[PDB]
DNA sequence: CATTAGA
DNA sequence: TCTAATG
């Protein structure tokens, strides 16, 4: 967590370019198993011949760690670090729509920049040119305070289409957070479940609502079941609009909701604790259900949830309130 | 890890 | 169809 930081730094440093720049998927894998069980390890690495004990560990990598811990650097990081391309590389994928395959493909075509992007906004598809025009808003964090007003106005509309919708919005918002990078809405309609074929415009209703406000004002990707997309508060009386959001709106299940709703708000480290748990109190937990383990090894069968509790209840635990969902 | 664009 | 990008 510390003892172990740099070398673990380096070595993710180190992996993220492969992969990247590179399209070298196996050392970067490779660094990243390393990078992990480095991690892991209760002890001071101090030489590579050390860190070389370890699995994962070959001698490509204790070499990078013996030049790490000797000097306080390493030359393939340096030059990488200075590298022009590679750094074009980094830079183009914060573009929302590009990503490791497309900033390559850019590059070679001579696009470096912000402005070559624009300058080019034909080799862009509408995912991308969306995420030109806002690339300062998308970079932007989400005052709570706005977190606040975005989902007082998001759950209205749900409600005015139809009163029998049940929206949740998700993430850290829901933990409380002070801010937050996008927001998650996660949706559902009792007149959809895991079987009941579908309704498409149970979602199509909503986004069409949305917009008709405004508070849609841009289509990223409109899928049956999930809506990714762009919005903005209104600019009230004037002196002051508000940037740019990303948002998404996802349908679900009625009878699927509260797992989904319970895992979408985390924390990462609360799931994946919550869900250890459930293991010995004999369950199983995912992003959908909850089903009882049978001692065969495995076992099956969706035990009914209708909230947050009953998962809970389930594994016998603490109703935690989102605010304390932390870990 | 599953859903969408796109070519 | 596959392949890329988001989450
Ligand atoms: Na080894
Ligand atoms: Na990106």
Redesign the pocket.
Known sequence: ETLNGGITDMLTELANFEKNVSQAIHKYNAYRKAASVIAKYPHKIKSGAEAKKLPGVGTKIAEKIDEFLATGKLRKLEKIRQDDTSSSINFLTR????????ARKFVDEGIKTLEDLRKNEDKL???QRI?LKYFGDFEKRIPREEMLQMQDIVLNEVKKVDSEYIATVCGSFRRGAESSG?M?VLLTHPSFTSESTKQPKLLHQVVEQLQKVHFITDTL??????FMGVCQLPSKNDEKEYPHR?I?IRLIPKDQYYCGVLYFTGSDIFNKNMRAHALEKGFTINEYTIRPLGVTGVAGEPLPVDSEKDIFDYIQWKYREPKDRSE
């Open positions: 573009v929302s729509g590009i990503g490791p395959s497309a598809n509408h995912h995420g996008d998650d990707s409109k899928g049956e079941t999930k990303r998404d």
